[PDB]
Paper text:
To learn more about the binding modes of the natural substrates determined above, the ligand-free enzyme structure of the E350G mutant and the complex structures of the WT enzyme with galactose and methyl β-galactopyranoside (MeβGal) were determined at resolutions of 1.91, 1.86, and 1.94 Å, respectively. All the structures in this study were tetramers based on PISA server analysis, although the asymmetric units of these structures were found to contain two, one, and four molecules, respectively. The three overall structures were almost the same except that a loop region (insertion 2, residues 506–539) was visible in the ligand-free structure. The reactions using the E350G mutant (a nucleophile mutant) were performed in the presence of various monosaccharides as acceptors and α-d-galactosyl fluoride (α-GalF) as a donor. Reaction products after the reactions for 3 h were detected only when galactose and d-fucose were present as acceptors. The pure β-1,2-galactobiose (β-1,2-Gal2) and β-1,2-galactotriose (β-1,2-Gal3) produced by the E350G mutant were used to investigate the substrate specificity of wild-type (WT) Bxy_22780. Furthermore, the E350G mutant used for a glycosynthase did not show activity when xylose was provided as an acceptor.
In this study, we identify a β-galactosidase with novel substrate specificity from Bacteroides xylanisolvens, an intestinal bacterium. The gene encoding the Bxy_22780 protein in the GH35 family is a component of a gene cluster containing SusC-like and SusD-like proteins. In this study, we found that Bxy_22780 specifically hydrolyzes β-1,2-galactooligosaccharides. We propose β-1,2-galactooligosaccharide galactohydrolase as a systematic name and β-1,2-galactosidase as an accepted name for Bxy_22780.
Residue numbers in the entry:
A (entry chain B), B (entry chain A): 20 to 522, 526 to 550
Write the structure that this text describes.
Amino acid sequence: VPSRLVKNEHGSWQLIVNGKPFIMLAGELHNSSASTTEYLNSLWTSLKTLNLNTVLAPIAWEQFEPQEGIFDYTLINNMIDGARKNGFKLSILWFGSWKNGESSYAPTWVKEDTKRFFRVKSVEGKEIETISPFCENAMKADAKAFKTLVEHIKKVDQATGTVIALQPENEVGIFQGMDYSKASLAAYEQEVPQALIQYMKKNRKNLRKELLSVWEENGARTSGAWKTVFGDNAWSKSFYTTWQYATYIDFISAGAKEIYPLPTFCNCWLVQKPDDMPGVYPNGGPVSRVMDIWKAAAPHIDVLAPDIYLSDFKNIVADYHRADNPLLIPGAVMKPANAFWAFGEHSALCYSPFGIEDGADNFVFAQSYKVLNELIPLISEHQGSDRMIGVMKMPGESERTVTMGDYQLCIKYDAEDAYGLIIQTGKNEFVVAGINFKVYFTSTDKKKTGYIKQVWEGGYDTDGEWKATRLLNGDETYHNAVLIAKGRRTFTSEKSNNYNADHIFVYSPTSYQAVWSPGIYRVTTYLR
Amino acid sequence: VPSRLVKNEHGSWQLIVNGKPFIMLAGELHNSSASTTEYLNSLWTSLKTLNLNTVLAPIAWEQFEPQEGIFDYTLINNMIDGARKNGFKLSILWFGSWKNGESSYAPTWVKEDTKRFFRVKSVEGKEIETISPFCENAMKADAKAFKTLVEHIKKVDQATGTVIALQPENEVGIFQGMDYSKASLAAYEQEVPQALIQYMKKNRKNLRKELLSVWEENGARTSGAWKTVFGDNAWSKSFYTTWQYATYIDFISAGAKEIYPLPTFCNCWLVQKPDDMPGVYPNGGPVSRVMDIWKAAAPHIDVLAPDIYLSDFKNIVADYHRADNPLLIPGAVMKPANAFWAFGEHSALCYSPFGIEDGADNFVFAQSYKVLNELIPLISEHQGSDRMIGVMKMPGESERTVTMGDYQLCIKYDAEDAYGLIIQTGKNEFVVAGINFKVYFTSTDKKKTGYIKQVWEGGYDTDGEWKATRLLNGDETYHNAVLIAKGRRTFTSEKSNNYNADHIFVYSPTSYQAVWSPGIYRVTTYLR
């Protein structure tokens, strides 16, 4: 297989694509944007301006299997062709049984047979436009269609590896406390599967507190029915619902894994607010609260991947990043700070703004992905190590202090939008990337004086070699008192006529207004 | 004849041009814009940008017969040539005896001979700049010139049919209660024509309440003078004045119909305000109040056509559209909503903004005509059908609810400017065109569930074949909860810089601002 997840010397998972470490500098198309060849083909040049290396794009079951047994390879073939022609990798999103909780992408022949493919029932007894996760017919039909898709991908792509990942379903779950279908009601009464109990015993110390607390409130029993082991309540209902979803999707993934195993992730719609009960978000999806249930139920799913559109980004990513779960963000906001934080602080595999094709000529985001691309080899070398951190200011923060080997770094922010990453590449050497912050280096050990030795601004060329554009000194480093991560500059056409001395004094007359994006800096340090 | 009016299976009148149904996506030139070949010829490229298929343009009697018996074919010839070169059909307006009530386009040799061609007189006894409709010399002179123009058109156009319709005179009538010329005063004393009496007897159930009530109030008499049959009042005055106008113009039309019968319409200056008496608007014109008088008097006039510049567009068009009177709007505002409403709700033959050459920069209007052109075959097939409706929001309105066979449609407006049309093309299929509304589909039969099955966005190509641009799903249909008629999108060059999440959540980042115009959607539904 040309794409594989492999744990590195630090215990961080890495994506190895065509034999090298690969980080998805990605974006996800709008949902309907891959539904015709012409519409998708109209987007490639937009996407290239953003410097993506990876596009997340859906294949819909309704179009892929328009009548049962009859497959249409038009869209996957054209998608793969266009990605190759435009220098992109693909992560294929499978909009099958469920997309945002519902079954709107199921085939017409699935939708119209509600006897074979039964629906979720509301508390009111009404069938909704969601196939029940308790319907094995649907599970089997979805599995067959997905495995057929993956068979084809292997046939047309095993040698090239344009396709590097798979996402079965999209943000699954019900907007209810439970499914009231007869099969759901019956499942709730059953014995808790031993695979879950055995996972909880084995992983007891590291279980989510949400699962552990319910289990323990009911005696932490190692057998019995759902309502015996977890009580009769919203959580027990969520737990057996989640078990069913993870189980159904695991079955779909396993069929694919058996013939062509690619890195496979499932994505969640987040618990939007801390008090929210299951069903205000999709009940069943791999939110962090039920991470253990998904891991226990679905070993053919590699990663549980948060879709993040909320402002509390740093806390959210820390919540999803675990020893058994690399950070992978398939839908997010088009904000470069978030990318640098995910990649540098949490060694993330993917950052992917949603609706990417509508953001062409977002210049700062584009130049941010250019800089991240230059850094992929170095980021890859330091994933999971304590020698790499992110930088990202949040409202009301003024600094970050960290210790890195012999040095203390005081990161101070110079604007609301301040972000980047820092890698200690050497005992006395750092690479700093980003914008709108400064770094002060001092000695950890107080019997010594630590100082910047030399600062170089630059980038990595198309061969991966460091090329310096300036040795930054004097005004540009306040005489090596500090690293200023001002960023790479781009003058605009607009006149600036800025010639007056501004009263540490630096005279910086300017004729044009300018635009700024992350820079890359190599700092050597010394102790005396 | 290459243009004719023919009633379809639904009893709606259609214009059949060169043997195919034709709807006039039209505009009228400013009055003086066809007065030289150079001035007209400078307009054709402007007109093409608006996606017109038809131009309404005048021929002026003063120019066509500048000396009695001497005809100048320069302007008609150049107009037909230009229309053919630029792919337009023509409706020819004949500005003869009257235009906007007055006689300013009568030839100089008519104007100067008030003995032969006598004028309307005011209540003060002043002769005005309007030829009296009681002057048979002017009727016959106008008729001879009009026939001569129509003979020429047949000679140069009977095979091509660039000219598809004729409008004799323009907004006729007097700004007085009655004409006070000798002949007018004598006519008021005459016996009501039997053709009017018999029309009222036979058509009583469909008569205007304006005419029926005055008849009834005076005993519904079947003989007697105007003042006996209708009383001595402003209405009686309007009725005999209107009879006169309709008779004079019928004679003019009849001479052309004998030699080359083209669809023929006469247009009105509306009753501007409900209390307005005859004479505040042109007394004699075919306003809906006296439409029965026009129908009784003028069998050689096919359509009575309102010029509409007032905002109460829906009430007005419903007032003019009758079983014996298709909707034809030769002068209107340049507003796409009005077009969609006229064509969809009332199966109109023509929509025509006045002063069209001035509106060449109207992107949205141009794109609206592009979509209506794509829909002409489909609109044509459903004219007069209960399967076709229009959509148009008026201030303060929130929704429209309609039944279409098995489905109930709830149309909700998402902006002030919300318009389009809806056609049920199948038991379980709809075409929806337009912008800024949503359509919710449910089942009429209360014990079934109706839902959207699939949604495509697209258009009709230059062969008339449907071409889908997307299968709309997910965010784009709220997971098939609703049809969103967002419209066809055109990015402008203007920067948007719009990357913030906006808290059903959809993440829609945009680099450029956009303009929207009507789209076309194909919606399949189902019942489970």
